Amino acid sequence: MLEAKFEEASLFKRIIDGFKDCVQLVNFQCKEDGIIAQAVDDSRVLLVSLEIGVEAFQEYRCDHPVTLGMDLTSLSKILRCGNNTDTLTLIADNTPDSIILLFEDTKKDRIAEYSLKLMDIDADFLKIEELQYDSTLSLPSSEFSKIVRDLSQLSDSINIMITKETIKFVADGDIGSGSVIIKPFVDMEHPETSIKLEMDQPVDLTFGAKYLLDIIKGSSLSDRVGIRLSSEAPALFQFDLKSGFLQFFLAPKF
Amino acid sequence: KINTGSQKGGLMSFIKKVEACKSCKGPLRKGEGPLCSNCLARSGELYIKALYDVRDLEEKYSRLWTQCQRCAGNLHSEVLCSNKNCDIFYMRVKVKKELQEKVEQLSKW
Amino acid sequence: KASYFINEKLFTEVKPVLFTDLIHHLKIGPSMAKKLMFDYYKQTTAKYNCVVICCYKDQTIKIIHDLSNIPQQDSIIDCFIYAFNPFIPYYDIIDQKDCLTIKNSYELK
Amino acid sequence: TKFNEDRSLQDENLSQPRTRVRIVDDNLYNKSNPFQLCYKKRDYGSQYYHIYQYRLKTFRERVLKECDKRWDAGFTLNGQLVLKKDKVLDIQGNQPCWCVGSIYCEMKYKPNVLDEVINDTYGAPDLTKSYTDKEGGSDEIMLEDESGRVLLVGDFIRSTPFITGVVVGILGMEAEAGTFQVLDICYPTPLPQNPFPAPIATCPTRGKIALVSGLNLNNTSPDRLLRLEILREFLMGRINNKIDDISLIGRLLICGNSVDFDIVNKDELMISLTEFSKFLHNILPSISVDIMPGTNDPSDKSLPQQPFHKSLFDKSLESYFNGSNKEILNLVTNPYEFSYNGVDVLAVSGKNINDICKYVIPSNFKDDIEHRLDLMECTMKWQNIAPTAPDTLWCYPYTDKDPFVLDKWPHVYIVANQPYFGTRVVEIGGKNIKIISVPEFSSTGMIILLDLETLEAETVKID
Numbered sequence A: 001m002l003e004a005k006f007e008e009a010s011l012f013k014r015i016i017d018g019f020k021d022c023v024q025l026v027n028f029q030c031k032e033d034g035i036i037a038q039a040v041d042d043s044r045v046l047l048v049s050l051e052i053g054v055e056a057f058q059e060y061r062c063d064h065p066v067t068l069g070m071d072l073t074s075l076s077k078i079l080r081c082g083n084n085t086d087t088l089t090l091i092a093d094n095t096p097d098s099i100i101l102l103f104e105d106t107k108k109d110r111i112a113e114y115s116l117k118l119m120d121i122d123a124d125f126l127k128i129e130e131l132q133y134d135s136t137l138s139l140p141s142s143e144f145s146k147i148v149r150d151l152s153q154l155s156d157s158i159n160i161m162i163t164k165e166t167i168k169f170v171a172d173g174d175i176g177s178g179s180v181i182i183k184p185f186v187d188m189e190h191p192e193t194s195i196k197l198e199m200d201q202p203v204d205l206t207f208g209a210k211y212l213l214d215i216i217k218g219s220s221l222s223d224r225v226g227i228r229l230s231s232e233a234p235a236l237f238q239f240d241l242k243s244g245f246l247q248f249f250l251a252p253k254f
Numbered sequence B: 001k002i003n004t005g006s007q008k009g010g011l012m013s014f015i016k017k018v019e020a021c022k023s024c025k026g027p028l029r030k031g032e033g034p035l036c037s038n039c040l041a042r043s044g045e046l047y048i049k050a051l052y053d054v055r056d057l058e059e060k061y062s063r064l065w066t067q068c069q070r071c072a073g074n075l076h077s078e079v080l081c082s083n084k085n086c087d088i089f090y091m092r093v094k095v096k097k098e099l100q101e102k103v104e105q106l107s108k109w
Numbered sequence C: 001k002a003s004y005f006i007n008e009k010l011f012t013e014v015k016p017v018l019f020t021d022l023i024h025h026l027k028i029g030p031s032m033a034k035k036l037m038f039d040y041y042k043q044t045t046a047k048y049n050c051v052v053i054c055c056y057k058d059q060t061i062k063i064i065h066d067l068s069n070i071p072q073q074d075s076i077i078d079c080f081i082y083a084f085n086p087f088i089p090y091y092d093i094i095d096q097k098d099c100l101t102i103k104n105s106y107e108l109k
Numbered sequence D: 001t002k003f004n005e006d007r008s009l010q011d012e013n014l015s016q017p018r019t020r021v022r023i024v025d026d027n028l029y030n031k032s033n034p035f036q037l038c039y040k041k042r043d044y045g046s047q048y049y050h051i052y053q054y055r056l057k058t059f060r061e062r063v064l065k066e067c068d069k070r071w072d073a074g075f076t077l078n079g080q081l082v083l084k085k086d087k088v089l090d091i092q093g094n095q096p097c098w099c100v101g102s103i104y105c106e107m108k109y110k111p112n113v114l115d116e117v118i119n120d121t122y123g124a125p126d127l128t129k130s131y132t133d134k135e136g137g138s139d140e141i142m143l144e145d146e147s148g149r150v151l152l153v154g155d156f157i158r159s160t161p162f163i164t165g166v167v168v169g170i171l172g173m174e175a176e177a178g179t180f181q182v183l184d185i186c187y188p189t190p191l192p193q194n195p196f197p198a199p200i201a202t203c204p205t206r207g208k209i210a211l212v213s214g215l216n217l218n219n220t221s222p223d224r225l226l227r228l229e230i231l232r233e234f235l236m237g238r239i240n241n242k243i244d245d246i247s248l249i250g251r252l253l254i255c256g257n258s259v260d261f262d263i264v265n266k267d268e269l270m271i272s273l274t275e276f277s278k279f280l281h282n283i284l285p286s287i288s289v290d291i292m293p294g295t296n297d298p299s300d301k302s303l304p305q306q307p308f309h310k311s312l313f314d315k316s317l318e319s320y321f322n323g324s325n326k327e328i329l330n331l332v333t334n335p336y337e338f339s340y341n342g343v344d345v346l347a348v349s350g351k352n353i354n355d356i357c358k359y360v361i362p363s364n365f366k367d368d369i370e371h372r373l374d375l376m377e378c379t380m381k382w383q384n385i386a387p388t389a390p391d392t393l394w395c396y397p398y399t400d401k402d403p404f405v406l407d408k409w410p411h412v413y414i415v416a417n418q419p420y421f422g423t424r425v426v427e428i429g430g431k432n433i434k435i436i437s438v439p440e441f442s443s444t445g446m447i448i449l450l451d452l453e454t455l456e457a458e459t460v461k462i463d
């Protein structure tokens, strides 16, 4: 019997809304050390992978590894029915036909017990074949999201140039072009505004903006994002969590 | 049913399949075998399901390829037919692939 | 011998008593069990439907029902009295220790 | 019977206390098995033409080892000296042409999957009692060969079965420039057959084996389990007045079709497997069994059926399934080649012979009483036990090696699941072999005590 009592429903709502658009049907694996769920989009170039360790939760009674066939649209509809003062708890019996979600308010008030039906997506559980990335950069997430937004406004193909320790985005469209050249920044006052490039290998890669527009949606969970780039290995965008991550795996178009 | 099979491309290559448990999809399958210690009581039903799937698939595969040979008129020669208007076209290859996957799944016991 | 008593325990219980149930209960040879069932049918006769199995020269081991006994009265070299019924849940698992007229030629290691 | 059993029920019962040790007759398994095909390394990407390539090659070689004898350069037919021209397509004149190639039958009632996909009636059951027209003569027989196919017409093809997949040398004459009048045929060369060391055995009675097939247990159970229990007791030395006559049964062979269910949702199959496991656990402490899978047993549908799996039996059998304990239970493949102390035995579930009967015996002349023994004799004249291996009785698309083609003639040849019982010793070039037709135990309770001393297939009917 799984019983994952959170600390605040906004955490899980943002966790889901970070990737509820790219993918739509996932398998949440409630194992004995938290929750882990990976999926791939229909275009098969984007792989979402989420890990919420047991530390992020408040209570965890799951004693047997269970699987939940979540449909992200219905679950987002359910999560939109949550307040900002509720301790959402996900309960599931031995053989789960449906999942129970309770947004019991801290002060004694109306408990919100929703029963969401589950499916069996019968998919495979995947994992990245790891490799030493050519450059593991860290960058404030809001700035990255703004950069992707204003660049994708121009064209539909964003390029990244990691050379000589200056992260560079370029986009060459029909109405013109746009080139952002941010230097590696570091400061003691604002730790979020920190950009430390790696001179391991120069990286010149171009990704489709139609996928970065979905990557940048999970920009609220992590105040800063870690982008790992390699000319052969597929790029990774890691949004760090309190006890996990919401990392995306994207492959440059070719 | 998310296929995600034989689609090796930009990202669908160099990816793993952790081979979760059967009938429960329990990731705690560190112990070898197609089943975890929790739902081991169903070890006589999942094998039946897999074996009967393999039976149906191999029967269909044999029927389709033997039918292709009869149509091609030749038995000792290779049938390299480009006719895409034949109902059995697009189906023989699908059944070959699906039977390959189901046989590889049956080979875990 | 507890034959007459342990048979009746299988008669208060409606479930039939095989001629091997005597071997299971009293741990005696098949011929003695057949003699026991025969005498029980002779002078110890509640009411029960009886079935006998008559051997032949061609080993045509037939269950003699409806008491016809017409085919080859003389070609019958032997006839046991089979189970007592007033069929049976078959193979009520017996350990078969010391109940074997013929033991196996192997080890079971 | 009250007095019929009176005189019968006075016995000696003197050899009761001691356990009568049975005989010891094993079979050699360490060597190899041409039919073993693990699910790993099982490539399905190939095509069914490699089987025919290998068949044509090896059978043409074996028959050319003997075609020169009766069809030499000096063989005359009073029309013109016979010609050796291969490539069956090149029959250009009335000269007697002799050539080798794979026979292919083309009936009109053979199940065509393309018609079923067109009419969208695939997956439905099939009556298909027979393939041959036999009322319009629409069926044809083509001597298919590498780059060639010539129809055969005449009267010689009316005697020989002429089943597809066989490779024999045909000598005939061109009739209508597309047809061929079969004048005679020649079969492959005789194979080697290991000797039969019958009297060398230190023990005087080398023992027998018990053959029983077509159990097909099902929840309907119209006394199918009653015959099973009677057979268990009979092999257990109880139903017989043992004078060391039932103690010489040793091994016990179950050849295919042990369970049965009308494929629903895998529930009756579990009860049938439970009953079979009960039978095995109740008979194994005294007898040693080895089970052959069938086309309805929970195993593959292709002919080289891999052995049963342990997951089909209960826990007592699982205990018997300990390693290095194959002498009690074996669970061999479907077509297996035992060696019961020198008696090389070949046993099949009988699906191949039934499929062959689909090629001759018509539905609504050759009937089926002893002609099935003739079909097995023909199968032994040829050197493969499954002539219609790719085309009609589906098999694995083997490449570069076919296990269905024979490499040596076995002393015994058992065919299970037959509608009748019959045995016959057939001699093909000195090497004479015994061929037994064990029937279905479900219809008729006949089991077969095959003696290993001198091959006397005695019958034991249970009713």
Ligand code: SF4
Residues within 6 Å of the ligand: B067, B068, B069, B071, B072, B079, B081, B082, B083, B086, B087, B088, B089, D114
């Ligand atoms: S796919 Fe169609 S055209 Fe091609 S061999 Fe099969 S039946 Fe003939």
Ligand SMILES: [Zn+2]
Residues within 6 Å of the ligand: B021, B022, B023, B024, B025, B026, B035, B036, B037, B038, B039
């Ligand atoms: Zn499990």
